[PDB]
Structure formats: structure tokens, C-alpha cells
Amino acid sequence: MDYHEDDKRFRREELCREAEFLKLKMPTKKVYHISETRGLLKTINSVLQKITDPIQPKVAEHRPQTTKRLSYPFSREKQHLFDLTDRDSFFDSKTRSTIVYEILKRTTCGITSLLANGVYSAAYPLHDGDYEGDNVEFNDRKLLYEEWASYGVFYKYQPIDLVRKYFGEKVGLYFAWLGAYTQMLIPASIVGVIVFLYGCATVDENIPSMEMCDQRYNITMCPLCDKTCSYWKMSSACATARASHLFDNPATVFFSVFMALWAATFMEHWKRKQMRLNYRWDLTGFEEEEEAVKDHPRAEYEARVLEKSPAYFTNLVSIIFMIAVTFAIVLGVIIYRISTAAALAMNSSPSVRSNIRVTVTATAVIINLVVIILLDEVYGCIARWLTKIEVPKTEKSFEERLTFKAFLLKFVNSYTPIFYVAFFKGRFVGRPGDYVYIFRSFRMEECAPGGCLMELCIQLSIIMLGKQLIQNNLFEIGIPKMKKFIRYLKRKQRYEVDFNLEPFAGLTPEYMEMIIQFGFVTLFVASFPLAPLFALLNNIIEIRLDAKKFVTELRRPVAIRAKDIGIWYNILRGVGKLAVIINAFVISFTSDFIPRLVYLYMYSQNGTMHGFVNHTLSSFNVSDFQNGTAPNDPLDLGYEVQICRYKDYREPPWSEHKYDISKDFWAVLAARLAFVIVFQNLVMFMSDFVDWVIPDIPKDISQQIHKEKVLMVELFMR
Amino acid sequence: MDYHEDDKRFRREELCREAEFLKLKMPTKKVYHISETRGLLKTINSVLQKITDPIQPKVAEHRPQTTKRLSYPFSREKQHLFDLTDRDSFFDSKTRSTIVYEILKRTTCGITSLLANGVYSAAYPLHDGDYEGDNVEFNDRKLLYEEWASYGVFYKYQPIDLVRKYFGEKVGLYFAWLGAYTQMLIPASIVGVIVFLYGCATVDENIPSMEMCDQRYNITMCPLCDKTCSYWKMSSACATARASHLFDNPATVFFSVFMALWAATFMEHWKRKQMRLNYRWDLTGFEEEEEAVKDHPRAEYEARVLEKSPAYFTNLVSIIFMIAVTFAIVLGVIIYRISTAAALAMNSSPSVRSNIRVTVTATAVIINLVVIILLDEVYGCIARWLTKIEVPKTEKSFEERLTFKAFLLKFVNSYTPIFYVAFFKGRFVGRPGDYVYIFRSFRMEECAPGGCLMELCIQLSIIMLGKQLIQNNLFEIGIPKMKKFIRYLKRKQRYEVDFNLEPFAGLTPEYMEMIIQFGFVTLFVASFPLAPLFALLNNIIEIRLDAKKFVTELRRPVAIRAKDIGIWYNILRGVGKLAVIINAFVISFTSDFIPRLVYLYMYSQNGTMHGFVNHTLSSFNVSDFQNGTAPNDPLDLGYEVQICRYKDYREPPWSEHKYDISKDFWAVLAARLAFVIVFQNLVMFMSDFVDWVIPDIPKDISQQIHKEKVLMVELFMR
Ligand SMILES: [Ca+2]
Ligand SMILES: [Ca+2]
Ligand SMILES: [Ca+2]
Ligand SMILES: [Ca+2]
């Protein structure tokens, strides 16, 4: 039989003598506050623990612990501090666990101090029962795993007060944030789907693609290759253009405006919901003023400076971390270069002779994804090490600086390839007269046949379906199970079957995955619609996956209380700040929309647009290729290749200045920057406007706190 | 002899019978709370009033009135609510006045209700003594007028706790805001002066102006006139260019970056100082929750909807006010058009024969200033009427909506001419082949000989020295004195010499003048340096002028307490938001700096720049002027005018396309928009960064409130 405990420990069953001395000096240091026993098994021991009501209301009143009462204004029971209980056990296991952890943190000998020194190896509360077993009696964990964590309740709201009461305000806050996230992605998903469907409706009726592969024109192009390539029909590469019309139309600009508006209204709506939850749960946010615990390395550094008697070394390791950030930027770009150069001279030595020319970039970004996964792991480790060497004075400051540094590193090495593809792909390439060669060795970069917006779109597609939806979830399932198999290959009481679980690392990784998701959603939505749909599917898996990870594998967290979400809301605000200018730069420099508008309203000469590809595509006297970097096999699929047509808005070779920058390039560049100006400033004003209209504090919650405080003093006077 | 009263009234000494009935029903409604008498003079009466300590601590404890004590942590005495007094009169006159006004507002029969209905005509507390008279005994008003309001103490700090204690937290907050304003304008003034001095050092050594009036080149220009003008040497108009080099150099961009940084650091520094003042004074900001008073028209509208049983009519009058705002925009532009067309055909009928060509624009903007002064008055009146018809439910909501509407109207009609001059002056003008004519009547607009940046700079100069420094201060002195002379032409006790003063209208006009000042300072600083200097002079007059206006003419205010400055900080944040994009547009489209950089780094052909004016200035076959709109007297001051040189970056007439837009215009336009992108985004990031670095809450003030609350409960337990 097993009674009702609150917290546990782990001694190691048998210098080490002084370790045992502290190992029995700390429990007798707390034994005049609490009560504890010791458990028995031949290879694994433990230290049980029991709270006493002599002490639990005493240290409960030590803080403003605000607990429920017996009076009710309008079916909404109030919450006083402590006056009368008449049950003596109406404190839940979560409250008992956080209060005994409060006592354990109060005694120092600081439980985490010696727990990090390694004289013990565990400190965890107890889960309540088994998840859907034999003759179980409907405890909180069983009902939670039934109605919340099952994959069959993916289409229903989550019991948020239940996950609060069983897990902690922080875990309840994370899951309610995910709920509001998915509920806000639903309409953005529907609008992305209808934008893509409008593109699918107008793709067979638009002008510039049906003429980009109108046949019987026999027009050629110029090889974007290195040395060993051939001229190729522009009409032979219109699968890419006819697919890119789905990703670029006058509706994607509408969806980008709507999506920046959606990001602002989501941040406002979750500020409203977070204030609502902070009212409904514990309200007050008066925490301790850096007075609870200091770090042991902090304290011995203060002892060192006392005995020897730093303050700018935080800034020195900050510029160290910025150099590491620029290091990671350049590493991400060169890793993408290596990955897109994973098939260099693929025709000579392997002689594949299949030549789909769609698969090489797929394998390229797959290798890129694998290397950035490994780099995500090593950057998380080095961010932990850098935040440890930063020596922050508190624990929350350590967590905040670690979160900021790890997010900056993960943002850098998860967005450098997409930045390089969407913006810097075919900019710095020269003309067919001369290109740019690194080390005077080979041509540096080349964009895609049919627009490397398609490279951007397939990269985003399989980085939302090949890393987020599949790889991240499969690793999140497998790494716990692989760790449990490596512990299995290398009836029982609750405090031991709880020990056979893996410890709770933090909410930082789940927050980080979801914020990188949010960056992928709101940062590159302009060229790529239905990215809300991929995020909706990933999150409709992710909420129940995290629920299973909490109630089925993870041992019980400490249930720490928190009002804010942390720095993650400021990080959301930063990503929503960057979203408008990156959508602007995508629409201008990538979407190939401003050149279409410029042609339509400057070089029309007919009314609507026609011959836009003949307007864009320049010409080139093919006898100007330098030093034998010509096409190594001029095949003459046509009668003879006389002029190759590359699109750069340059002057034709039958002019006085040949291969010079024409007026049209400066015209489209000026109008592109004009659209960045107009779009960025207009949607920034619209974002601040929809922030200003929607009130931060809920009107209903202000009414509830008004009537609640009114009745509080009206019942306090009598 | 005169005893110590707190508040006054005014009955009218002799329907009107019911008026007298309410006139003696209201004082007997309050007489079981307070004590009052009645005064005597043959033509003017009054109603005196006296508080009693039976009642004043009673309603003082009714609110969290926080008063000083007898204990002190480290020469900083604490502030409890009410426990022990042992003096019975340590409440100041300000506290007694605001508490008797609290009682008067509590009784409704709402003192302002019947005061607005007009059964009384005054409600004001009593000033303390005479300002530097005969045998006065150094009261608060006398010491205040001596050491604060004198013009001889303009170079010393202001007694801020003294003006707090004598006037109110709101008036103390306004004057401390002005103090921090001038203290922040001092370094911006010094940097503006050194930027102007650098311009004065490099003006005789720069390239483009010394060649703009290098002689012995005999170059001509093309008349920017209507019909009756002549060609004119470009070297004859270099006073304008040699003066515009002072206002445009590579240092004005530095000063614009520094000034946006200054605006952000000023807002942050005043947030710090406002939190410091809110700690040092009354701290808590828990006001009443819309429960103190409702408006009488609000209440009778609720009676109307009760008897008949609107909510969107606030939005209907809001779009009405937006139509009025666009009305005021177009009115300001057409008023500037009328003012700059105040001398139309000035040579034919008057035959001035002086022709300085610098004075017509001066008289133009003078007429513009007079008409916008009259429009400022009528817009203030119509904003009061629109906010009254908006029917806000509270009084603070009425003041806030009135402030926002009046500021939007004053911003519109005080910045539309400067916007039209700095941006839209010479844009929509065509070429000498064809211009644009309204109604096919006459040419619409023309820019200045030598750049209408000089028009902008003289307009800003005499709108900071001819409206702010001179006209506003002289009207602020005279209108009180003119009202006192119109009351004089159409010994005594304190409650009557106080009645011979003019009532306190509000702090909204002084706030409004200073915020329009701040807009002039931070919105158009890029082209115009040393505008901080003009603001420093205006404010170094303005603080002592407002101090004299308070302690010498204005009757004593009610001394209302407030934590925030109001919506004026949000308005400062909005102006600082607009400042970066308007500085960007000034530097690009007005400063003539991006064309110089574009010439230097694209069309150099020599190294440094030379012949920039010959690069900018196009040509025009003078036989192409249409329909006899040629120069009406081609004087041939040279040998013969063959080609007139206008600057539009257009193609010369000896090309295939003549008078077509050249490549250079699109090049300089693209680079202008690139600089707007770079400057706006970079300095917006720098503004948010210098917001993030400086903490909002002062670290010292957090220490003080920490030790204060610690000792509060440590003395409360015992
Ligand atoms: Ca996932
Ligand atoms: Ca995850
Ligand atoms: Ca003034
Ligand atoms: Ca003034």
C-alpha cells in the first residue's frame, strides 16, 4: 500500500564520505520543517517526503498564495488568500508539490545547488495514477490522457483548466498559446487555400506564361550553365512558369497584406486571452525582487572578488556571440553552396542519362536540411555553454539570455538558405559577355530556368513538409523511445515507475520549434500561399503530440507559476516586425510582379500586356563568349543559334553601347523600391492601427475584476 | 482681517426664482458636510467656504490620500496614508482645496453641473498672498514668483517640488516636462550649431556651388515664369545655392540620424524622469473606474433612451471629423497657393521696379501665417464643438478626444504649407515643351531659382522666428492684458482680488504649442539644422512666460493629481514615428544629396565630382515653346539664346527621342528610393535599439521602492 507523498529525491546506494555527510546533513537541515522517509530496493533507492498541515499553510501564507473560497458572485467563486478551509486536504497535489519545492529551495546547505553538484540525482513530484490501465479510479492524469492527449480528440478544444491544475500555470499557458495559435491559423489557412484556388483558376488564362510556352515561335535562350551546356527553348521550361503563376498573382499581394494584418491581430488576440487567463487563474505578478536564490558559481565569484578586492565581460562575451552569429551566417550560406554543389559535373563521371533537372535541387536541399539539423544540435549546445560562461546572477536571467542566444542561432542557420535563395540567387551574376568567378576558378552562382522563385517555393514546401511535419515529429517521438530502449537494454511503486521516466528538460524547445514555425509562416508568406495550411497540419499534430509527451513519458514538472509567456512574446513581436519588410522585399525583388506592372503601365502600346517575355528577354551576339567558355556542344536543335536571349534588361548588341544597362532596368528597379516604400509603410501603419483599435485589456475582464474587488471589500468590512 | 478659507463660489446679486431656490438648496445640501458663509459688496458678491477637521480626514481616508510621516529611512521620509498628525493643520492649502473640491464634486443636486447650467459663475480656490508686494511674509506664491517665475532666473533650475506643492501634480508635471525638454535641447542645439559651422567652413571650398556661379562660362537657363519673363544666368543665382550648401552637406545627414536618436532618447529619458517624479510624489495610480461623475447631457440622453426603449454615431462623427481633416488639408494647400499668388503680375500694374525677388515669398508666407492663425482659432472652436457633439460619457474621455481632434487639426493646418514646399513644389511641372495648366488657364506651380529647398528653409526660419518666438509669445502676453483692459474700461480682500483674475482654461493649449514645436524640431531637421537652437530660445522664454502666466494672472487651479502626462506622450511617440520617414523623404526628394552621390559614384570620369551642374542641367531647343507662351521679351543679354538649360534629367534635343526621360532620371530616382529604404529601416532599428538599451523603470527608483516597502511592513508588524 502507498500513501500520499509530494516530492522525492535520489541518494546513490552503496570525497564520497563528505558526500554522504552532506547527504544526511541536508535532510536533517529540513527535518524541522518537513517529514521524510527512505525507500528500499536492491539497486535503486529513493528518499520519500511528506508535507504536514502544521507547516503547509504557514509557508503558504508566506507568499500571496491565492486559493478558492466558498462564496460566489454570479457562479464565479472568488479567491481570497487564507481564512478558512474546513477540509484540511483541499490543496491539490500540484500546490503541495510546488510548496514543498519552495521549502526545498529555501533550505540551502538551494536544493538545485547540491543537485547540480551531484550528491543527489533526482528531485521530482509524483504523477497521479496510471494512464488508462486496469481498475484505475479516474484521477486527473487518466482523465487528462483520455480527453486531452488522445489523437482521437484532435478536433475538440483542450481542457485548459484541467491541464493547469495538473501541470502548472506555465504548461497551461504554453498549451493555451498553442490553442490560440491553431485557432488563429484556421482562417489564414482558409484564405491561403482560396488564394491558391484563384491562382489555379487563372493559370490557364493569364498572358505571360501561355506565351512563355506558346509554341511555333522557335525562340531560344542562353545557357546558365558553367561550360558544358546547350541553348534551350524558353517554351521547354514553362512547367516552372505555369507553376510559378500559382505562387505569384495579384492575389498573393492581397494575402501578404492580410497576413501581416493577421500577425498583428494574433498578437493582440493572445494578449487579450493571456490577460483573461491571468485573471481566471492566479492574478498578482509581484514576484521576489532577485532575492530567492543566487547561483553557486555567482556566489563563489563574489567570494573571489571579495578576497581579491568582469562587469564588462558580459559585453565581451556578447560581441563574442555576435561574431559567432556572423560565423553561423557565413556557415549557413557556404553549407547551402556545398549542398547545391553536391552534384558537380554529374554528366561526365556517373553518366546518369536520366536528367529530370528537378531532382538535383531536391537532393541539394535535403543534404542542406541534414547539415543544418546537426548544426542546430551543436548550436544549442554551444549556446548553453556561452550562457553558462556569461555568468548571469539569477536563474531567470540565465534562461532568458540562453533563450535569446539559442533563438538567434537557430533563426540564423534555419533562415540563411531561404534568404540566399529568395534574394541573393541570381543578383550578382553578370551578363553572357562576362560573369564573376571566385579565385578565377569557376562561375559563382546561377539562378533557375524559369525563375528561382520556384527554387524558393520548393525549398519552403519541403522545409515545411520534410523538416517540420515529418522529421521534427518523428525525432520527437523516437528520441524518447530510443532513450528508453537504451535504458531497457542497458506492481512496482509509483515513486519508481515515475523514476523510470525521462526528466523534464524545459519548455524552451517546444516554444522554439513553434516560434521558428511562426517565422516560416509570417516571414515568407508573400511568394508562398497555403503555408498557414502546412502550419495548421503541423500544429494539429503538435498539440496532441506534446500532450502525449507530457502525460505519458515526461515525469511530472515542478509546476512553477508565471504570468507572462516570457521573452517569447517579444520574439513574436520582433518576427512580426521583420515580416513586413521581408514580405516587401520578396514581392519586389523575387515575385516578378513589379516588372509585370511596369510593363503594363509603361510599355503597353496595346492596352493589356502581351509580349512581356519578349520585352524582358534581351539579346546577345553569341560570338562574344570569352576564352572558350562557350557552350561546349552547340547542338543546333534549331537551324542555327545566332542570338541567345537572357533576361537582364540590357541593351541589344546592335546598339552603340552593347550589353549596357538599359533604361528599363533602372525603371523597374525604381518602381520596385517604390513598392517596397509604399507596402512597408502602409502595412506598418495598418499594423499599428489594428493594434490601436483592439484593446489590450479585455473589457469583460475589467468588469469582472471591478465587481470582484467591490465585493471583496464589501465582504471584508463585515 | 481675513481667516483661512479653501474654496469660493459666486451667486449673482439681485426661472430666476427656481434659480435662487437651487442656489440655496445646494449649499444646504452640502452644509451637513462643510461650513460656508457669504460676503458683501454692492455690485459683486461671493460665497466663502471653510473646511473642518471633523470632515477633512474623513474624506481624506475615503481615498488613498498618501501623506508624509515622522520616520525616515536615510533622510528620505516615508509616506503612509493616515495614522497620526499632532499638528492638525499640516495639510497644505492645495490639499485642502482639492479635498473640498472633491466634496463639492461628490454632492450633485456635481458642482460643475449647475456651474455649467449657469446658476453660479465661479468655483476657485484661494491664492496665498501677494507676489512681491509690501510687508508680505514670504508665502509660497511670493517665493515661487521670486525664484521661479522671474525672467532673471532663466538660467537656473526650477523649484519643482515648490510648484508641485503650490499648484498641483499636473502643473508640476507640465513644468518638469518642459525642464527636461530644454535640458535635452541643449546638446541638440550645440550639435546643430557645429553642423552649421562645418557648413560655413566648407561652403567656400565645395565644388557644385562655386561652379554654379563660376563666371566666364556664359551659360543660361530657361525661364520658370508664366509668360512674361526672360532667360537668366545660372551664375546670377548662386547666393541661393551658396546658402543652400549650409543647409545641405554630408553633415546634415549625420544630424538627422543624431536627431532621430535624440528624439528616441528624449522620450526614454522623460519616461525615466516621470517614473522618478511619480515615486517622489504620490505613487499609486488606482483611480476611480468611471464612477465619479457622468455628464448631465449623457444622463439625460440615457433618460431619453430609457423613455423611448447612437452607439455608432461616435464613428459617424469620427468619419465626419476625418472629412473635416481632409477639408483642412486642401484648405491649407489652397491657402498657401493664394498666399504665394498674392503678387500676381506685380510688374505691369504696380510697376514696383525694385525687384529683389526674395521679398515676394516672404510676404507670401507672412499672409499664409496670418490666415493659418485665424484658421487655428476657428479649428480649435470647431474641435470643441465636434467633441461636445460626440457626447463622451466621462469628462476625461471628452478631454482626450478633444485633444486628439484639436491636435490633428492644428498639425494639418500648421504643416500643409511646409509639406507642399518641401515635397510637392517642383514635382508635377512638365518640361519647357509643355507644362500643366489648371482649367487650361495658367501654369500651376513652379519651383525656385536655385532650388526651392531654400523656400523650405526660409519658411521654416520665419515660422520658427515669426510665429513661435515672436507672435505666439506676444499674443500670449497681450490677450490676458487686453482682456484685463477690456474689463478695466468696461485693501480689497483676497477672494475678490482673486476674482479680478482670469480663469484657468487648461493645460491643453500649452501642451499643444510645445508639441507643435516638437514636430517642427524633429520633423524637418534634416534640411534645416540649428532648429534645436530656435526651439531652445523659444523654450528658455516659454518656461518663465508660463510661470508668470500662472503665478501673476491665472487664478489658482484646482490642483488635480495625475500620474501620466496624458495622450501627449502617445502624440510624442507618433511624431517621433513620423520623423524618420519625413527626414528620409526630405533627404532624398529635397536635399539634392542623392543626385550628387549618384553623379560622384556613377558619372565621375575624373575621380571627384566636377561639372555636376552641367551633368544635371539638360537642354532645350528654344524654338519649341508652344502657342506663344515663349519669353515675352527675349532680351539677348548674351549674343543670342539658342538653347535654354532646365534641370530635369531629360534627353537633349539632338537625339532621336527629344525631351524624353533619360536613363539618369530613373537612376537617381532608384537611388533616392534606395536611400529612403536604407535610412528609414536603419534608423528605425537604431531607435528601437536605443529604446531597448535604456531601461524604462529607473534602477535607483526600484531600489528606493524596495527599501521603502521593506521598511513599511517592518514598521507595520511592530
Ligand atoms: Ca513539429
Ligand atoms: Ca515539438
Ligand atoms: Ca511659444
Ligand atoms: Ca505658450
Swiss-Prot record, chains A, B:
- Tell me where it resides: Apical cell membrane; Presynapse
- Keyword Transport assigned to the entry: answer is yes
Q: Altering H615A: what's the impact?
A: Increased permeability to chloride ions
What disulfide bonds does the UniProt entry report for this chain? C213-C238, C222-C644, C225-C229, C447-C452
The effect of Q517A is: Increased permeability to chloride ions
Instruction: Note the effect listed for K490E.
Output: Reduced anion permeability and increased cation permeability
Please list the residue ranges that the record places on the Cytoplasmic side of the membrane: 271-315, 386-403, 475-507, 550-566
Question: What chemistry does it catalyse, as a reaction equation?
Answer: chloride(in) = chloride(out)
User: What's an example Gene Ontology biological process for this entry?
Assistant: chloride transmembrane transport
Quote the annotated effect of S461A.
Decreased permeability to chloride ions
Quaternary structure, per UniProt, is: Homodimer. Interacts with CFTR. Interacts with TRPV4.
Query: Any domain commentary?
Result: The region spanning the fifth and sixth transmembrane domains probably forms the pore-forming region.
Its biological function?
Calcium-activated chloride channel (CaCC). Plays a role in transepithelial anion transport and smooth muscle contraction. Required for the normal functioning of the interstitial cells of Cajal (ICCs) which generate electrical pacemaker activity in gastrointestinal smooth muscles. Acts as a major contributor to basal and stimulated chloride conductance in airway epithelial cells and plays an important role in tracheal cartilage development. Required for CFTR activation by enhancing endoplasmic reticulum Ca(2+) store release and is also required for CFTR membrane expression.
Q: What is this protein called?
A: Anoctamin-1
In its UniProt entry, the species of origin is given as Mus musculus
Which gene carries the instructions for this protein?
A: Ano1
Tell me the part of the parent protein that is shown: 117 to 910 of 960
